[PDB]
């Protein structure tokens, strides 16, 4: 279906694949960006411990601070996904 | 110039006005969303201590975790600004 293009990552290759998997599941289940974001966030809080934050959209710029090895920014189809741990 | 509409806030009224002021300055200085976001973030890290994160755009949904009293989501013109402290 949708093409995963990883743009910037500070994250193990294993967890990068988990991120792409999660977002694919999220996009399968939800249509609204905040719901997609919430699905991805909660699953990472569950799997990799708090505290994650997720942004999903077609138009945004960001500037965030993340713990090393806990950052990924990627496209899955025409939507961009920012996912990182801070706190 | 641009209209500040606050959508969701968990933040003192004082700091809410600071946020709107900062974003207005950012939009005066920068055109690119990531640069606008960076300006706002760094100024809040400076003024209110780390760690802030800022998202600026016309199309995004988000799900984040913030420290109480340190969250604002608002429109300034046709751009939306998410600004919150976590970490």
């Amino acid at each position: 279906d949708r093409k995963a293009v990883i743009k910037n990552a500070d994250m193990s290759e294993e967890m990068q694949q988990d991120a792409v998997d999660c977002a694919t599941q999220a996009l399968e289940k939800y249509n609204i960006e905040k719901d997609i974001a919430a699905y991805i966030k909660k699953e990472f809080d569950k799997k990799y411990n708090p505290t994650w934050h997720c942004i999903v959209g077609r138009n945004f710029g960001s500037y965030v601070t993340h713990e090393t090895r806990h950052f990924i920014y990627f496209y899955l189809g025409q939507v961009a996904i920012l996912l990182f741990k801070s706190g | 110039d641009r209209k500040a509409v606050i959508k969701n806030a968990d933040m003192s009224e004082e700091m809410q006005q600071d946020a709107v002021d900062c974003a207005t300055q950012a939009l005066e200085k920068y055109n690119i969303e990531k640069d606008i976001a960076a300006y706002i973030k760094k100024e809040f890290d400076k003024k209110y201590n780390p760690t802030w994160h800022c998202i600026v755009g016309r199309n995004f949904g988000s799900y984040v975790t913030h420290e109480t009293r340190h969250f604002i989501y608002f429109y300034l013109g046709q751009v939306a600004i998410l600004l919150f402290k976590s970490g």
Binding site: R58, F60, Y63, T65, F71, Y73, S86 | K34, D35, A37
Partner: peptide, 10 residues
């Protein structure tokens, strides 16, 4: 332990 990142949609 932490880094700052900028992202921009194209």
């Amino acid at each position: 332990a932490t880094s700052a990142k900028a992202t921009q949609t194209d």
